Amino acid sequence: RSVFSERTEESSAVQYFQFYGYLSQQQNMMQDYVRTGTYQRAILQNHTDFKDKIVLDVGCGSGILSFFAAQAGARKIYAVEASTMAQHAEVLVKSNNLTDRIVVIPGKVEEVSLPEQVDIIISEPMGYMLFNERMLESYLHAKKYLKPSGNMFPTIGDVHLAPFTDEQLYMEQFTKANFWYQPSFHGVDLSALRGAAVDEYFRQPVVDTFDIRILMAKSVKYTVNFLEAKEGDLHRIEIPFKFHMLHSGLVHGLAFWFDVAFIGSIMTVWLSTAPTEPLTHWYQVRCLFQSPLFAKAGDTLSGTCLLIANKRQSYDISIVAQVDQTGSKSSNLLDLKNPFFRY
Amino acid sequence: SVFSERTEESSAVQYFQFYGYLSQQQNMMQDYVRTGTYQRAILQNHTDFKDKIVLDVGCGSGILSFFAAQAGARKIYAVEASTMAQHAEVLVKSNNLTDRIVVIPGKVEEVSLPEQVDIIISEPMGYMLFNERMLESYLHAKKYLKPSGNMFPTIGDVHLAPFTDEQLYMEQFTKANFWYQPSFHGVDLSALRGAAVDEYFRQPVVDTFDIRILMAKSVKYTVNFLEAKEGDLHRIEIPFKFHMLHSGLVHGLAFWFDVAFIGSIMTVWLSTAPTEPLTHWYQVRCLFQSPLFAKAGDTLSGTCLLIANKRQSYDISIVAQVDQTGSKSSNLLDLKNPFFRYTGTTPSPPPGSHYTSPSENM
Amino acid sequence: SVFSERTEESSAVQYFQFYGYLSQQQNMMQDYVRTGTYQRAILQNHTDFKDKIVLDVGCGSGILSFFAAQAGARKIYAVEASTMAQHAEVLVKSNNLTDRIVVIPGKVEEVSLPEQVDIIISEPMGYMLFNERMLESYLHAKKYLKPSGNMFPTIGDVHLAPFTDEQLYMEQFTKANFWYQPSFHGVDLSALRGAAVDEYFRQPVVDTFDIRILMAKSVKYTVNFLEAKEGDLHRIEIPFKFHMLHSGLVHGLAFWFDVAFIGSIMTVWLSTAPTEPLTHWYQVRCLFQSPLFAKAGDTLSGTCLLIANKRQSYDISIVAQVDQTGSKSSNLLDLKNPFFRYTGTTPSPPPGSHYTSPSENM
Amino acid sequence: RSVFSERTEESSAVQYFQFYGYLSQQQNMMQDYVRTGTYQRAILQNHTDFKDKIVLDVGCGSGILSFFAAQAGARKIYAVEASTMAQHAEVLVKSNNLTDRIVVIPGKVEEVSLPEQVDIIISEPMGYMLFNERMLESYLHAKKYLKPSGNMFPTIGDVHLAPFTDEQLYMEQFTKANFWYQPSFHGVDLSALRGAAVDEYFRQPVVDTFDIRILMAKSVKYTVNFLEAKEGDLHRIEIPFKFHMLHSGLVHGLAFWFDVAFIGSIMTVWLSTAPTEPLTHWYQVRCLFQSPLFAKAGDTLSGTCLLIANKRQSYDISIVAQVDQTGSKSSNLLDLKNPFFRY
Ligand SMILES: COC(=O)c1cc(O)c2cc(NC(=O)NCCCNC(=N)NC[C@H]3O[C@@H](n4cnc5c(N)ncnc54)[C@H](O)[C@@H]3O)ccc2c1
Ligand SMILES: COC(=O)c1cc(O)c2cc(NC(=O)NCCCNC(=N)NC[C@H]3O[C@@H](n4cnc5c(N)ncnc54)[C@H](O)[C@@H]3O)ccc2c1
Ligand SMILES: COC(=O)c1cc(O)c2cc(NC(=O)NCCCNC(=N)NC[C@H]3O[C@@H](n4cnc5c(N)ncnc54)[C@H](O)[C@@H]3O)ccc2c1
Ligand SMILES: COC(=O)c1cc(O)c2cc(NC(=O)NCCCNC(=N)NC[C@H]3O[C@@H](n4cnc5c(N)ncnc54)[C@H](O)[C@@H]3O)ccc2c1
């Protein structure tokens, strides 16, 4: 009956919150210096957004973002966390003598009761491709506690997509799938599953990094304004694209990364996962076409990337792309819950 | 059903989703030691299959059922609970075996088989043999076994042995010491250092190693799948008395396992020991929170107790003491969250293994 | 002599052995910023050298004396205390300058010059300008300077500025946490963790960095070598009042230095600032034991006090406080045991330096 | 008047013991797992050599070898250390509750007074090429405290030498020296020092590792038996060699490494720094010829490596080698106190 339980299979929320209950996973996020340090400077450089203000921290984990708000001068910080990591955050609040300013509230931000409205919400809700794990919806849901003049850190998110060429990556996944092309594996004919295997392997998003050299067009941008958007905006996300090809070659898929901006009163600070910037634990994400498209320079590649939210805290992705000049069309389904980590 | 009473839905969902992926089936099939040994065991005991009725528990892609067909089975009931059952059906049709192999989608605890069978085949082994608790489904399946029937595999041997690996032990503290700093971005993390140490030590270590890190002949615990009941695997007590062959710090116990296919014609072994070629079961090591000093000739004794839980795994309790000194150590480990440490690098030998000059051996 | 009273033999032995190596001379000579700038300063002020008498203090290979010859000096007394003096003599003969350059082996505090000189040249700068305490030998040498005379360099500017570098700070604790383990080969090391932390923090860090880690306009302390006495460098007090331009954790103070050659024709600068090309002096950073939080507009104030020691270096005392909050930090550092951290990698910019989208800038 | 002060310039002992007073340097030795673990297993596997015995630890540093003797069962351990690291060893003895068994005695083993004789001496006295730092002499000196039936850990040391070919290493050092070949560096003629520069650069031992492929002959061995040898044996060390060349090519120098053996009652354990074994903090050492020697397979390369001990706790090395068939001779002086670390 709570907003989170309606949209989430229990079997997926159990695994999800158990994963973030491990300190080792908190350490891995924290040790991303670009991630942690960029959050810290966005907050401190905009200290006036926090001085003597009331703060809500959505999914605080170890509580590290709350400690940044305390350093900035916040009067009171409500740090909500649904995993068992809440108990460990409490320990750190006590041992850092911040019991009067940081108040850990265990539970799902959709279900807990907060004693007052807040001036600013902070969170790190971004998954792979920004939208994975569907935590952006909890972040937006928490705006019920936001004063009208309130702010949000991060304030906006920019998804970027660009076609790429990478025949090695394409052949690696085709070669894996071609295991099921065999007619006499230990005397057994597997070939009838060759099609299902290629489908499974290519519905996998490839999570790793790559050189910008492989991008064949200026990137297309899709913006979410966290101040303006509703929770229901993210159940069906439609990203049209029209790429002007700058090189000829085989387009093997679309590469995704994202940027978020902390728009404070004093300055705007950007956190970027772009392939031109230092690597973060979000890497970049590439979706492969089962069959590459040929395009020459000056052609336009157009279509739509439709993300339909599912009950496993992820998205069914549909990418349809066509070379307009030739009508060469590629249509793909990617399962954002079973990625292929290649790094 | 028996399966749902002992399994939280969360665990079963993830479990059968995992085995539904063809990529996962392919990983198991591409373990040649595993797949070749099963094939040899079945075909070299063709008399145990010629014109017999067979039950394949958790058939996955069906590969073990196809081996039973190659051996001459009249009828094979291939039970699979993941969505892989539908892909196995496809393979049965395209291999023209629809009259000999019948795929029955569902849990073996819940489905209806139309007759008793002469032999049950399966690959129910997890890490340390027992992980994933599928051995219970294998034993449960004996309700369909004719009284004279057989099981492939027939018996399972778990082997435990003390090891010394200073690097493995110190690695835990090096990772946890991330939290022992007073100003991580202005925050004092040190109150969590102890909790981080505990978390790492609760993890069984899945990788391989050089056998010279073992300090005593292994101790064997045997399950006979023909005799054993489901209930026997809820609480598994493994007493051990190790007679130390080397002096050093015992940092934990190493686990591996063998299974034997005892056919009418011959007995075939599938071994995951560290002295045999590596398999996708590797080996498992459970660390002691505090190491024990032992000299050669000392005895190291205690109990490994495995208590089944509803997440299809086991809580592991290990208590051990050096009898000559009374020095004692324990540990509790969660077999459900193993740490996969395998790098691909050939395991390096323990320091101080050269009894002759390495410069002369050049 | 003045040199032996202020220098323990142990330090002088190692010091003059080090500069006796031609490999070391070559390293200094191959710093093009250093050697080119000195050459330009001397030649572009040829009137300050044409037919003048010159003293080169610590001439090493003699390279600065050859520049003074190229500028027209009548006579050059080239004093060097290491065994490099004999190699400089060889270069004076093979360059046919025996009538203009005279190499006088020995310490400038102890040797006898046959006449007063019109200008003294030297490269006495160490890390943070003052390290190695050769500036005192440069000033001591003014006993040979005619009253109208000049000094090349003429003045030295030390610049200090607060920096934020979370990684540099956390690195100290990560290294020291080697000792925070209870069973390193069966030994509990943790009682030494505190001593290891202290040892690392007493080390000035010699490497370079991105100027965006600086949080305030630098503060300048000037030595005028024409006016300054030897005794002025035994105790050097540098008060500072920084007006913070960025908010963040101040992890310490960064030091660099400039020198100026003020000739009759022009003033030439040799800068080791982080905004200029890298030199073999790099930059020096002294960490605070505990960082200070400061917001933009706050004032950070305190004193850097350098006390000379007999190991030809300085004990550094740094005290600093954020005035708005009273938050205070100190540190004591031994400039004689710096930590050389330079990797060769271009310094990476502080996180949160992007005020516009990096994905748009593509 | 003490044996150490007679053979050591004070200016060299000051630097030497200050270097080993830093915990960071103790950490670097300790973190050599081959070094530390091989000492620990040599001691524990031979526990009977230690059970209820009296032990002397020469230059114990942090005290880690003493703790190994305590684990083996030693009744009493005298842990001598001349650097300020002695104070830190005391701290560890107290915090490990071994005050009744490990007795730190600050000072030089040549100068301190020990209350009784010992059954076994332990130490890590080996430097680069084994003999650098001249600590083997303190180790041997400490035998005045050794019972007649006593043992020593390590018991023997084997130096190995073998000719090598490595034109890249040779050209790197020649290229550095050729800086001083210039006739107009900023208008100055440096060429007169070209000879002195080559001499300086090539008197440097090269400390790093290398592949066995570069060795041109089976290695020659020189043994020191620590039970038998006197302190004065190491003031003048003469190592003759006669190599049977197994490949043709340029011999650019001699490569040195060493092995030590712990000969206990129960078994012998070897610690090796050979290029075929895992790297240690001793690496290997190569001495270059200013001019390479040509040899063909089947030729013999013969000569002598003479090490004369000096007052800087090091050795003046003289290597003379000749290809017997052609009489091609190379003569070299290497200064073991100023090595070139290439790793
Ligand atoms: C299955 O195995 C795979 O193949 C796999 C698949 C994936 O998609 C993965 C994907 C991986 N992803 C990351 O690398 N992720 C890090 C960045 C985000 N980390 C963060 N701080 N955000 C979440 C926190 O917020 C809390 N939280 C959420 N929702 C609520 C709510 N409603 N109420 C209160 N708290 C809430 C959570 O408990 C956390 O405290 C890794 C590994 C992955 C592995
Ligand atoms: C989370 O990340 C980790 O750290 C982690 C942890 C684990 O415990 C893992 C553990 C990992 N696992 C294996 O090591 N896998 C290989 C061993 C052999 N494979 C096998 N045991 N497959 C059984 C088949 O039998 C079916 N089956 C089961 N029960 C029934 C039933 N009642 N009825 C009908 N069919 C049934 C199943 O669907 C299968 O078709 C991997 C990865 C793992 C990763
Ligand atoms: C231990 O390892 C470390 O961590 C470390 C520590 C240091 O402090 C170092 C420090 C390092 N040093 C430099 O940074 N070096 C370059 C700066 C410019 N070079 C210079 N300052 N050279 C002066 C010349 O002048 C002579 N000279 C001195 N005094 C007198 C006198 N009284 N009479 C006559 N001649 C004299 C000398 O012999 C020289 O011919 C390097 C390496 C260092 C390494
Ligand atoms: C100048 O810069 C360079 O270019 C350079 C040159 C070298 O030759 C180096 C060479 C380097 N070498 C090692 O890498 N060395 C580690 C292995 C040996 N470490 C050990 N444990 N042995 C000594 C201990 O024994 C104590 N000790 C000695 N003599 C006595 C005595 N008489 N009484 C009591 N205690 C004594 C000492 O204080 C120590 O506690 C490194 C760096 C080096 C750097």
Numbering used by the authors:
A (entry chain B), D (entry chain B): 135 to 477
B (entry chain A), C (entry chain A): 136 to 497
Task: Quote the original article.
All six cocrystallized compounds (12a–12c and 12f–12h) adopt an overall similar conformation in the complex with PRMT4, revealing two common anchoring platforms, the methyl 4-hydroxy-2-naphthoate and the adenosine moieties, each one occupying the same binding site on PRMT4 regardless of the different linker lengths. On the contrary, distinctive conformations are observed for the linker in each compound (see below for details). On the other hand, the methyl 4-hydroxy-2-naphthoate moiety partially occupies the peptide substrate binding site on PRMT4 and mainly interacts with Y262, P473, F475, and Y477 on one side and F153 on the other side. Surrounded by such a “frozen” binding site, the linker of each compound adopts a unique and distinctive conformation stabilized by interactions with the protein platform in a region mapped on one side by catalytic residues M260, E258, H415, and W416 and on the other side by F153, Y154, and E267. If the linker is shorter (as in the case of compounds 12a–12c), the two guanidine-stabilizing hydrogen bonds established with the PRMT4 main chain are lost, and this may account for a weaker affinity compared to derivatives 12f–12h. Regarding the linker between the naphthylurea moiety and the guanidine group, a length increase from three carbon atoms (n = 1, 12a) to four or five (n = 2, 12b, and n = 3, 12c, respectively) brings additional van der Waals interaction with W416 and Y262, thus substantiating an increase in affinity and a corresponding decrease in IC50 values.
Protein arginine methyltransferases (PRMTs) are important therapeutic targets, playing a crucial role in the regulation of many cellular processes and being linked to many diseases. Then, another series of compounds (12a–12h) were designed and synthesized, introducing also an adenosine moiety and exploring the distance between the three groups. We also report crystal structures with various PRMTs supporting the observed specificity and selectivity. On the contrary, we were able to cocrystallize the compounds in the complex with both PRMT4 and PRMT6.
